[PDB]
Amino acid sequence: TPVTLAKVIKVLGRTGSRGGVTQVRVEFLEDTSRTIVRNVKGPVRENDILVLMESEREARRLR
Amino acid sequence: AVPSVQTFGKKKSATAVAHVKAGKGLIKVNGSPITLVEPEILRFKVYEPLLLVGLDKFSNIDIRVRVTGGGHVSQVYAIRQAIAKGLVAYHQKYVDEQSKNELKKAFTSYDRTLLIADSRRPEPKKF
Amino acid sequence: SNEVLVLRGTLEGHNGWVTSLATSAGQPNLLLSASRDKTLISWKLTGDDQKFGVPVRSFKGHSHIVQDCTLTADGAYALSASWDKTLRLWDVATGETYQRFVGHKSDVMSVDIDKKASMIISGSRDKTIKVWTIKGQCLATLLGHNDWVSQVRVVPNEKADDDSVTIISAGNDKMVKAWNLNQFQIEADFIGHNSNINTLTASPDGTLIASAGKDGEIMLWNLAAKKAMYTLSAQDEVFSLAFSPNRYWLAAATATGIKVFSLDPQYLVDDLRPEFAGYSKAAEPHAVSLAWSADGQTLFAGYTDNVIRVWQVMTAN
Amino acid sequence: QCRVCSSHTGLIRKYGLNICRQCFREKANDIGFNKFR
Amino acid sequence: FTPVVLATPIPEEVQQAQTEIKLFNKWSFEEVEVKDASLVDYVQVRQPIFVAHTAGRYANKRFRKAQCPIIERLTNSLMMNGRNNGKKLKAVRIIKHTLDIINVLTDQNPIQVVVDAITNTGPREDTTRVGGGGAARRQAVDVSPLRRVNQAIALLTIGAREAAFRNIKTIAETLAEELINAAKGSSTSYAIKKKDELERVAKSNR
Amino acid sequence: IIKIRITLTSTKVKQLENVSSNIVKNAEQHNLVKKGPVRLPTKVLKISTRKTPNGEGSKTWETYEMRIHKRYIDLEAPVQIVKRITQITIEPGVDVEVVVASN
RNA sequence: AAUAGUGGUGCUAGCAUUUGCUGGUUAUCCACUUCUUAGAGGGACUAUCGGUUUCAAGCCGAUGGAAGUUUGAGGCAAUAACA
């Protein structure tokens, strides 16, 4: 299966109608030069492992 | 005369005084052996101070504890507060400190609330 | 050739800061140690360059910071001066103290014992000086200062007990006064320190009196001429002091390390400066109390992070 | 009894003082009751 | 191993391997098993346990929440409605009557059958919990791992209540078959077949 | 020359440690046998009453308090020693009692 | 501290008995305050280190600590049309 093994680097801020989701900076482990953001929902901190499917199609920002 | 000390342990207004004496080794919970406490599921919570250091240091001891107060659940927590801190008074009056700290480190590595009781009292309502 | 001091051990038995260590003249195998954390700890000097073994006793009897501990030459008893107006007469075997004291209004700051074992002097932070019996009775209060007091010292009477005992005090009014016991009187007024006097010790001969305060003004005094021979500027803050018992080396415990001098001439042998880890460099730990051997061949140093290190006086190569 | 201030009900029968509670709030000081918590 | 005696007549069977580094009265913690890279950090609290009951202080900062044991967590979730709020002693009776009925069902480690089970049931994708501002839509989103474990365990639990509501079978009979169903990827249990269809429409919406 | 017992149950705690001090003062200047002032658990009074004269408005209440402290001393003395000193330790708000119970 | 409690000395019953573990109560008497109650004081200040920020006010971790969410909860505090 196409796994996407990811590691959060920097936290940026909550965004949303309620701020229920958070935009962070995440890194890919298998390619350590992948600077990309991700709209992760939940309590987040440094140094987490992020399962993921759609490796490219992601909203860079929200209203 | 005999080496003898007193400790006590509390949880949620439930006290448990302890009398330490020296002898073949009898552990008396309010006039009964310790292997008969009625919350049968929590029977091993009282075994935890004994089953951390080995069954060795007790052919020279005698333990009589008695409790008041609390419910049927807190008194299980109260007895193992006074018992576990009851053993160190030998080793802080008679036996040396290197023997003291090795089990001091052994207890508080496993349970901070085996030595220090909790601090979570209740609260008044609609006032 | 010279006294180099290599690291010989490390003690970890406290969680305050140490306040006074104490060695026995008779027994060379133990160390009395007091600290800020309301504890008294007596050690076992297991000579080993990996550690020193056993803190053989603990003494749970007080309620606040203790300041200075003293004992006998052979190691028979022990005394303690904690901040809550309390003085305790300890044994050395069991832990059982004898009698508490009701005599002051402040922190009892410094005490001392005569070698004849009859009187115990006490200077406390309520600008008064008190003397006590062996059973612990009041004899006479003593006034004269107007600021606090830090250290009081009895003279080493090495002249075969020729009725010569006198008490020298480290006040807080930039003042160093000398107090007789046999006639109960002021003896000499020492003038010259410009700030808060921090520590004073005299020579092991009882002849050369050193005094040094907050500015780092090591002002030497004599026992009889009582003059300002040496006025050393330690250019720092010094906390406590150190005299080699057998040799003629006088040392000081500054906040910036550990400095040592010879009597004559002026030999800055070493700076005893230990090593730490993990610090922004405005945060290096430093010692406040230090002590010699019974033969001046080992030196102890307790620090703020509860480490007590030891060295040995071997010759320089 | 009806003591004073349009009350014969809500009397404080406890502690044997028998005061209409409308006329207790203004008399509870000099009896020696005071609120603290 | 050398059963010493006291003036208390102590039974030997609480001293055989319990004085040895095996801790729990019937199982151990040598069996460490990592399946996902997310679970490597916090779920298997490497500490001993005997009864799975203590007064944890984890509810006053959201990451001390992680350090409580897994077995303690599942018992906490058994207080479900206005009949079992506070019957913790009832719950631990249920749980210690379930590992026995696990291992007699042709397997090797009763604590293993749940730690692999939550690997499947941590939902890798998600919807969003927003309408969208009139257009009640569902946009691109993913889940934090510490949030992932929370809903992972809880949906396994709630299926067992109606599985044991009003039918002859007991709770321990439900929790047996549910977790071994949850142990593999079968989607035959309600503990699985409601998290799956969440993820399938999440493969649509985004 | 009889064992006696004194009680004092007052409500001004500052004006009960002056009285209990001068009780043990003049007894010890005559050095009688005594046992120290045993201090009992205090008693509090309370009455909840809602805070409106009429009834029209939101609802929470008051709570009033009154504190009673009580301590007592046992004593033995010749009667001429005690019958004078119990008449010079008066103070308003303070109650004094003598009990000579020797059953 | 017989208007709380244990610790013995006893009178005293069991006692597997055999050293022993449970009892015995007014007054058998003495010695005790840890638990208990109430006076007098003490103790925490965000302490000490690591990050972060105009390096400021502060906010996050950390180990110690009975206690580190204003330490937990209350009491007390007047501008106004409910005639």
UniProtKB/Swiss-Prot annotation, chain B:
Q: Which UniProt keywords apply?
A: Acetylation, Cytoplasm, Isopeptide bond, Phosphoprotein, Ribonucleoprotein, Ribosomal protein, Ubl conjugation
Point out residues bearing the modification Phosphoserine: S32, S59, S74
Which InterPro entries does the UniProt record give? Ribosomal_Su5_D2-typ_SF, Ribosomal_uS9, Ribosomal_uS9_CS, Ribsml_uS5_D2-typ_fold_subgr
What GO molecular function annotation could you give as one example from this UniProt entry? RNA binding
* Lineage: superkingdom: Eukaryota
Where does the UniProt annotation locate this protein?
A: Cytoplasm
Q: Where is this cross-link: Glycyl lysine isopeptide (Lys-Gly) (interchain with G-Cter in ubiquitin)?
A: K28, K45, K57
What are the transmembrane regions?
Answer: none
- Residues found modified as Phosphothreonine: T68
A single cellular component GO annotation: cytosolic small ribosomal subunit
Q: What is its main location?
A: cytoplasm
Q: What is said about its interaction partners and assembly?
A: Component of the small ribosomal subunit (SSU). Mature yeast ribosomes consist of a small (40S) and a large (60S) subunit. The 40S small subunit contains 1 molecule of ribosomal RNA (18S rRNA) and 33 different proteins (encoded by 57 genes). The large 60S subunit contains 3 rRNA molecules (25S, 5.8S and 5S rRNA) and 46 different proteins (encoded by 81 genes).
Q: What is its biological role?
A: Component of the ribosome, a large ribonucleoprotein complex responsible for the synthesis of proteins in the cell. The small ribosomal subunit (SSU) binds messenger RNAs (mRNAs) and translates the encoded message by selecting cognate aminoacyl-transfer RNA (tRNA) molecules. The large subunit (LSU) contains the ribosomal catalytic site termed the peptidyl transferase center (PTC), which catalyzes the formation of peptide bonds, thereby polymerizing the amino acids delivered by tRNAs into a polypeptide chain.
Recorded hits in PANTHER family, A to Z, give: RIBOSOMAL PROTEIN S16, RIBOSOMAL PROTEIN S9
Give me the gene this protein comes from.
Answer: RPS16A
Curated annotation (Swiss-Prot), chain C:
Compartments it resides in: Cytoplasm
Entries under SUPFAM superfamilies matching the protein = WD40 repeat-like
- The residues joined by the cross-link Glycyl lysine isopeptide (Lys-Gly) (interchain with G-Cter in ubiquitin) are K44, K51, K105, K135, K159
The extra comment attached to this record reads: Present with 333112 molecules/cell in log phase SD medium.
Q: Report the Gene3D superfamilies cross-referenced here.
A: YVTN repeat-like/Quinoprotein amine dehydrogenase
Judging by the UniProt lineage, the source's domain of life is Eukaryota
The record's GO molecular-function terms, alphabetically, read:
G-protein alpha-subunit binding; GDP-dissociation inhibitor activity; protein kinase C binding; ribosome binding; translation regulator activity
Q: What does this protein do?
A: Component of the ribosome, a large ribonucleoprotein complex responsible for the synthesis of proteins in the cell. The small ribosomal subunit (SSU) binds messenger RNAs (mRNAs) and translates the encoded message by selecting cognate aminoacyl-transfer RNA (tRNA) molecules. The large subunit (LSU) contains the ribosomal catalytic site termed the peptidyl transferase center (PTC), which catalyzes the formation of peptide bonds, thereby polymerizing the amino acids delivered by tRNAs into a polypeptide chain.
Per the record, residues carrying Phosphothreonine are T94, T166
Write down what this protein is called: Small ribosomal subunit protein RACK1
Q: Give the GO cellular component terms, alphabetically.
A: cytoplasm; cytosol; cytosolic small ribosomal subunit; nucleus
Query: Per the UniProt entry, what species is this protein from, by scientific name?
Result: Saccharomyces cerevisiae (strain ATCC 204508 / S288c) (Baker's yeast)
Lineage of this protein's species?
A: Eukaryota, Fungi, Dikarya, Ascomycota, Saccharomycotina
Family membership, please give it. Answer: Belongs to the WD repeat G protein beta family. Ribosomal protein RACK1 subfamily.
InterPro entries found in the cross-reference section:
G-protein_beta_WD-40_rep, RACK1-like, WD40/YVTN_repeat-like_dom_sf, WD40_repeat_CS, WD40_repeat_dom_sf, WD40_rpt
Swiss-Prot record, chain D:
Cite the entry's keywords alphabetically. Answer: Cytoplasm, Metal-binding, Phosphoprotein, Ribonucleoprotein, Ribosomal protein, Zinc
Q: What GO annotations for molecular function exist for this entry?
A: structural constituent of ribosome; zinc ion binding
**What biological-process terms (Gene Ontology) are attached?**
cytoplasmic translation
User: Where is the PTM Phosphoserine found along the chain?
Assistant: S6
- Entry cofactors: Zn(2+)
**Cofactor: binding details:** Binds 1 zinc ion per subunit.
Q: Where does Zn(2+) bind?
A: C2, C5, C20, C23
Location comes to: Cytoplasm
Q: Does the keyword Nucleotide-binding apply?
A: no
Q: What does this protein do?
A: Component of the ribosome, a large ribonucleoprotein complex responsible for the synthesis of proteins in the cell. The small ribosomal subunit (SSU) binds messenger RNAs (mRNAs) and translates the encoded message by selecting cognate aminoacyl-transfer RNA (tRNA) molecules. The large subunit (LSU) contains the ribosomal catalytic site termed the peptidyl transferase center (PTC), which catalyzes the formation of peptide bonds, thereby polymerizing the amino acids delivered by tRNAs into a polypeptide chain.
| Assembly and interaction partners | Component of the small ribosomal subunit (SSU). Mature yeast ribosomes consist of a small (40S) and a large (60S) subunit. The 40S small subunit contains 1 molecule of ribosomal RNA (18S rRNA) and 33 different proteins (encoded by 57 genes). The large 60S subunit contains 3 rRNA molecules (25S, 5.8S and 5S rRNA) and 46 different proteins (encoded by 81 genes).
Belongs to which family? Belongs to the universal ribosomal protein uS14 family.
User: Anything else the record notes?
Assistant: Present with 6490 molecules/cell in log phase SD medium. There are 2 genes for uS14 in yeast.
Curated annotation (Swiss-Prot), chain E:
Phosphothreonine modification, residue list = T8
> InterPro entries this protein is in?
Ribosomal_uS7 (IPR000235), Ribosomal_uS7_CS (IPR020606), Ribosomal_uS7_dom (IPR023798), Ribosomal_uS7_dom_sf (IPR036823), Ribosomal_uS7_euk/arc (IPR005716)
Give GO terms: molecular function aspect only.
Answer: mRNA binding; rRNA binding; structural constituent of ribosome
- Cellular location(s): Cytoplasm
Q: Which UniProt keywords apply?
A: Acetylation, Cytoplasm, Isopeptide bond, Phosphoprotein, Ribonucleoprotein, Ribosomal protein, Ubl conjugation
Q: GO cellular component annotations, sorted alphabetically?
A: 90S preribosome; cytoplasm; cytosol; cytosolic small ribosomal subunit; ribosome
Record cross-link Glycyl lysine isopeptide (Lys-Gly) (interchain with G-Cter in ubiquitin), residues: K26, K184
GO annotation terms (biological process): cytoplasmic translation; maturation of SSU-rRNA; regulation of translational fidelity; ribosomal small subunit assembly; ribosomal subunit export from nucleus; translation
Q: Name one Pfam family in it.
A: Ribosomal_S7
State the post-translational modifications.
N-terminally acetylated by acetyltransferase NatA.
Is Transport given among the entry's keywords?
Answer: no
Where does this chain mainly localize?
cytoplasm
The organism sits in which domain of life? Eukaryota
According to the record's subunit comment, the protein's assembly and interactions are: Component of the small ribosomal subunit (SSU). Mature yeast ribosomes consist of a small (40S) and a large (60S) subunit. The 40S small subunit contains 1 molecule of ribosomal RNA (18S rRNA) and 33 different proteins (encoded by 57 genes). The large 60S subunit contains 3 rRNA molecules (25S, 5.8S and 5S rRNA) and 46 different proteins (encoded by 81 genes).
Query: What family is it from?
Result: Belongs to the universal ribosomal protein uS7 family.
Q: How is this protein named in the record?
A: Small ribosomal subunit protein uS7
